[PDB]
Amino acid sequence: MKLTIHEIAQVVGAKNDISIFEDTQLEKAEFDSRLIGTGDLFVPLKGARDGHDFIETAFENGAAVTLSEKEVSNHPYILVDDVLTAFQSLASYYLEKTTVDVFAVTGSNGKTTTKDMLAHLLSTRYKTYKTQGNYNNEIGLPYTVLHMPEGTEKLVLEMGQDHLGDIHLLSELARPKTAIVTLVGEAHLAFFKDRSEIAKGKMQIADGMASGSLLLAPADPIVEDYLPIDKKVVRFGQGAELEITDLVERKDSLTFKANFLEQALDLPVTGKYNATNAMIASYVALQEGVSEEQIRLAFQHLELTRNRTEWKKAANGADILSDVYNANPTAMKLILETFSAIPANEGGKKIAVLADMKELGDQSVQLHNQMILSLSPDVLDIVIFYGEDIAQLAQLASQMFPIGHVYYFKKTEDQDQFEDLVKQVKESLGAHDQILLKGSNSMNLAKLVESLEN
DSSP string, 3-61: -BHHHHHHHHT-SS--TTS--PBP--EESSGGG--TTPEE---BSSSBGGGGHHHHHHH
Which CB, 255 or 326, lies closer to ligand 2LG? 326
Backbone angles phi, psi at 205, to 5 degrees: -60, -20
Which CB, 17 or 50, lies closer to ligand 2LG? 50
User: Is-contact 139 145, C-beta < 8 A?
Assistant: no
Residue 51 found at the interface with ligand 2LG (CB under 6 A)? yes
Residue 264 found at the interface with ligand 2LG (CB under 6 A)? no
How far is residue 225's CA from residue 325's CA, in Å, rounded to a whole number? 36
Q: What angle do CA 363, 368, 373 make, to 5 degrees?
A: 125
Residue ranges in 92-111 that form contacts with ligand 2LG under rule CB under 6 A:
none
Residue 330 found at the interface with ligand 2LG (CB under 6 A)? yes
Residue ranges in 344-363 that form contacts with ligand 2LG under rule CB under 6 A:
360-361
Q: How far is the CB of 322 from ligand 2LG (least distance, A)?
A: 16
> What's at 34, amino acid-wise?
R
Residue ranges in 363-392 that form contacts with ligand 2LG under rule CB under 6 A:
367
How far is residue 416's CA from residue 401's CA, in Å, rounded to a whole number? 25
Q: How far is the CB of 94 from ligand 2LG (least distance, A)?
A: 18
Which residue's C-beta sits nearest to ligand 2LG? 47
Residues binding ligand 2LG: number (CB under 6 A): 22
Residue 67 found at the interface with ligand 2LG (CB under 6 A)? no
Residue 34 found at the interface with ligand 2LG (CB under 6 A)? yes
Residue ranges in 130-149 that form contacts with ligand 2LG under rule CB under 6 A:
134-135, 137, 139-140
Phi/psi zone of residue 273: left (φ > 0), alpha (ψ -120 to 50 degrees), beta? alpha
Range in contact with ligand 2LG (rule: CB under 6 A) among 31-39, 278-286, 399-407, 444-452 = 31-39
Which CB, 218 or 329, lies closer to ligand 2LG? 329
Backbone angles phi, psi at 427, to 5 degrees: -55, -45
Residue 326 found at the interface with ligand 2LG (CB under 6 A)? yes
List alpha helices for 71-180, DSSP H: 83-98, 114-123, 140-146, 166-174
Which CB, 262 or 359, lies closer to ligand 2LG? 359
Q: How far is the CB of 454 from ligand 2LG (least distance, A)?
A: 31
How far is residue 433's CA from residue 313's CA, in Å, rounded to a whole number? 11
Would you call 179 helix, strand, or coil by DSSP? Answer: strand
Which CB, 79 or 331, lies closer to ligand 2LG? 331
Among residues 255, 305, 328, 428, the one that binds ligand 2LG under rule CB under 6 A? 328
Task: Tell me the helix, strand and coil percentages in the chain, rounded to 5.
Answer: 35, 20, 45
Q: How far is the CB of 134 from ligand 2LG (least distance, A)?
A: 5
Which CB, 136 or 182, lies closer to ligand 2LG? 136
Which CB, 176 or 329, lies closer to ligand 2LG? 329
Q: How far is the CB of 30 from ligand 2LG (least distance, A)?
A: 9
Residue 291 per-residue DSSP state = -
How far is residue 32's CA from residue 251's CA, in Å, rounded to a whole number? 42
How far is residue 10's CA from residue 13's CA, in Å, rounded to a whole number? 5
Positions touching ligand 2LG (CB under 6 A) are 31-32, 34, 45, 47-49, 51, 134-135, 137, 139-140, 326, 328-331, 334, 360-361, 367
